[PDB]
Amino acid sequence: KPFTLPILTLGELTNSRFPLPIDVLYTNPNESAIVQCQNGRCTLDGELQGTTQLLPTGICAFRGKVTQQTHWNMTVTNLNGTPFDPTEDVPAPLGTPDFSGQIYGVISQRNTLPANRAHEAVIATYSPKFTPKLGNIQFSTWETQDVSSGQPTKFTPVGLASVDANSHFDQWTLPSYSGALTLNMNLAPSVAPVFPGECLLFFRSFIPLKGGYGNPAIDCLMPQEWVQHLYQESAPSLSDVALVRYVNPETGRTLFEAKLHRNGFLTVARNSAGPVVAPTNGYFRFDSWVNQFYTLAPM
Amino acid sequence: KPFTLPILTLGELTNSRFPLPIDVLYTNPNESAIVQCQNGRCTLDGELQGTTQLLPTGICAFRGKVTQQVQDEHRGTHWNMTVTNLNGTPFDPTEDVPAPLGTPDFSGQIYGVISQRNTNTVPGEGNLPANRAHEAVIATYSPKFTPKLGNIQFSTWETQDVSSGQPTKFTPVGLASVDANSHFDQWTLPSYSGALTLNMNLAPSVAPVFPGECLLFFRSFIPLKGGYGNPAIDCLMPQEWVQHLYQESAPSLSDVALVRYVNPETGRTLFEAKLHRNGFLTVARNSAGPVVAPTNGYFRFDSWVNQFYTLAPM
Numbered sequence: 166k167p168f169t170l171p172i173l174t175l176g177e178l179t180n181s182r183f184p185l186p187i188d189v190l191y192t193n194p195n196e197s198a199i200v201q202c203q204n205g206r207c208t209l210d211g212e213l214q215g216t217t218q219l220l221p222t223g224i225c226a227f228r229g230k231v232t233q234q235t236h237w238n239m240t241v242t243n244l245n246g247t248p249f250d251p252t253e254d255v256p257a258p259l260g261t262p263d264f265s266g267q268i269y270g271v272i273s274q275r276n277t278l279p280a281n282r283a284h285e286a287v288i289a290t291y292s293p294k295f296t297p298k299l300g301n302i303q304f305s306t307w308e309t310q311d312v313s314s315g316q317p318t319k320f321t322p323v324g325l326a327s328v329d330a331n332s333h334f335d336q337w338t339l340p341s342y343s344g345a346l347t348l349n350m351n352l353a354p355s356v357a358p359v360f361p362g363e364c365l366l367f368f369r370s371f372i373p374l375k376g377g378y379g380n381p382a383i384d385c386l387m388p389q390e391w392v393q394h395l396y397q398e399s400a401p402s403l404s405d406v407a408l409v410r411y412v413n414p415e416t417g418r419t420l421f422e423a424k425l426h427r428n429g430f431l432t433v434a435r436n437s438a439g440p441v442v443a444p445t446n447g448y449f450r451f452d453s454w455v456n457q458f459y460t461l462a463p464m
Numbered sequence: 465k466p467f468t469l470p471i472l473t474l475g476e477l478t479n480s481r482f483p484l485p486i487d488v489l490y491t492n493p494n495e496s497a498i499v500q501c502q503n504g505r506c507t508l509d510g511e512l513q514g515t516t517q518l519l520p521t522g523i524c525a526f527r528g529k530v531t532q533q534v535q536d537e538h539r540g541t542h543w544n545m546t547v548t549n550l551n552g553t554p555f556d557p558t559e560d561v562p563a564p565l566g567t568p569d570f571s572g573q574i575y576g577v578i579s580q581r582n583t584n585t586v587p588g589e590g591n592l593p594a595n596r597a598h599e600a601v602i603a604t605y606s607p608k609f610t611p612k613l614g615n616i617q618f619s620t621w622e623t624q625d626v627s628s629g630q631p632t633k634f635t636p637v638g639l640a641s642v643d644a645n646s647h648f649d650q651w652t653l654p655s656y657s658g659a660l661t662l663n664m665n666l667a668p669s670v671a672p673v674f675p676g677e678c679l680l681f682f683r684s685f686i687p688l689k690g691g692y693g694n695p696a697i698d699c700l701m702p703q704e705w706v707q708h709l710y711q712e713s714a715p716s717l718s719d720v721a722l723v724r725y726v727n728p729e730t731g732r733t734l735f736e737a738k739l740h741r742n743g744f745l746t747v748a749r750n751s752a753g754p755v756v757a758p759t760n761g762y763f764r765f766d767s768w769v770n771q772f773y774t775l776a777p778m
């Protein structure tokens with residue numbers, strides 16, 4: 166069964182690590198951190214890994230119930246409402262955020278015609294109280310009282326609360342899904358170029374801010390639509406590296422080429438940082454299976 | 465090119481009319497309103513229609529700029545914002561669409577968050593722009609809701625912290641209210657150019673054309689900022705079907721495709737349905753309410769038939 170990628174321009178793709186459209190392609194060769202994100206992780210033959218799931222509405226979302234108290238403790242279930250089983254071979258409930266920061270969104274409740282309420286809320290994923298693998302998290306509100314206990318609760322993500330020093334935003338620092346003294350488990354593996362002159366290529370989105378100064382961004386290894394496509398196709402991988410070309414359909418010319426690695430990420434032969442300037446109509450097309458000694462044409 | 469549907473369970477599908485997961489399949493044979501939604505509209509050979517676009521993040525979203533604070537009789541602080549296309553290019557009112565793609569397609573008080581990132585930077589803050597976000601409501605039935613003209617109005621609880629002339633984003637979250645005075649009706653279209661003007665370039669209405677059949681919907685429940693209610697949004701096809709049909713572009717070999725809802729574990733057909741060329745489903749059922757089916761079920765394409773095919777009763 167032949168391997169394929171969808172035909173979608175950058176303006177038709179969304180981020181797999183936060184609910185945002187893709188804004189630009191991006192490189193940063195001098196990144197010193199280990200890249201080991203857990204959302205947007207899928208092998209080329211269609212195996213989801215980490216905390217990755219298929220719903221665009223599930224990325225950085227939570228479902229559960231508030232237990233007690235401005236901060237509130239919430240037990241979390243699986244996104245489909247079934248109880249989360251901590252013994253399952255996953256790092257945390259699928260969809261759980263995969264980075265350190267103060268995530269800003271809306272908590273809403275519909276009581277078990279029922280009464281309703283919603284408020285702005287913040288979830289600090291670096292907090293010792295952020296233990297989703299144990300089945301519970303904490304969120305804070307500006308609202309001081311009108312949050313009900315024991316009623317079905319939803320968290321809709323919107324952006325970040327802040328990116329100043331005291332807010333610990335770092336997109337490559339994983340949360341401690343079970344707490345500070347416990348090791349994370351069942352992680353999708355780290356990714357990196359394994360050839361001189363190459364660097365990772367990211368799909369970059371800019372993320373909203375509730376206040377303060379800054380222009381924060383979230384980089385993903387593959388867009389959510391690629392995760393969904395690879396899962397459907399389940400095409401066998403015929404080598405460890407696929408050669409793909411970024412083409413201009415109008416002119417028919419290749420703008421640059423890249424390696425698409427079996428574990429699900431891209432590298433290019435580029436020695437600079439920043440956005441990739443390309444026509445709006447461009448997209449990646451599969452060319453052939455190669456190996457780890459293939460020399461990419463410098464972009 | 466053979467016609468195909470994706471292999472996705474209800475728990476793997478999302479709504480095409482609001483950013484929500486699909487909760488249940490649903491029927492309502494005695495519906496009196498004309499069904500003519502504009503999001504989630506796609507022919508079986510892949511032609512997007514109405515205000516439909518591909519991004520799940522674009523459904524009921526807006527991008528643009530706030531111009532100034534304005535007066536309005538209703539409770540809150542009100543603001544005018546010009547809107548562009550979702551990709552930032554100017555919206556061209558002469559394009560053959562009802563409104564900018566992504567525009568909401570129903571009457572109601574849509575609740576969400578307005579956020580801004582300034583274009584100018586502050587050297588004292590490391591050459592970085594200032595930001596703000598606040599809860600907001602957009603009343604799609606208001607005479608000031610004129611997206612086809614390039615501008616809309618929204619209200620906030622916050623009284624002052626919204627800047628003029630800065631890039632602005634609306635992220636939808638749910639409804640503000642469903643009380644009588646909030647005019648929620650999922651089948652009543654907005655007046656995209658304002659009161660007393662005729663909407664144009666609409667995706668066509670859908671209806672059964674055979675005795676004993678009714679429309680079948682993918683239903684999601686939508687959050688509420690406050691008040692009583694359990695509101696729902698019904699779409700004709702999920703967003704992942706819109707995305708699949710657009711990619712495949714398979715020619716339609718008749719006006720109706722016969723599809724079966726199968727339980728892959730046992731391999732059995734749970735019920736069958738007609739998938740019409742314009743992009744909607746009908747079933748042979750004479751009751752309203754949810755379809756109770758196993759969690760593993762999904763629709764599978766069987767064959768092209770015609771409008772005189774008799775479906776097996778559900």
Ligand SMILES: C[C@@H]1O[C@@H](OCCn2ccnn2)[C@@H](O)[C@H](O)[C@@H]1O
Nearest residue numbers: 375376377378593594595596597625
């Ligand atoms: C940078 C600011 O951050 C937030 O105010 C926080 C305090 N503050 C006011 C002025 N400087 N700091 C936003 O509410 C503002 O509109 C503004 O963007």
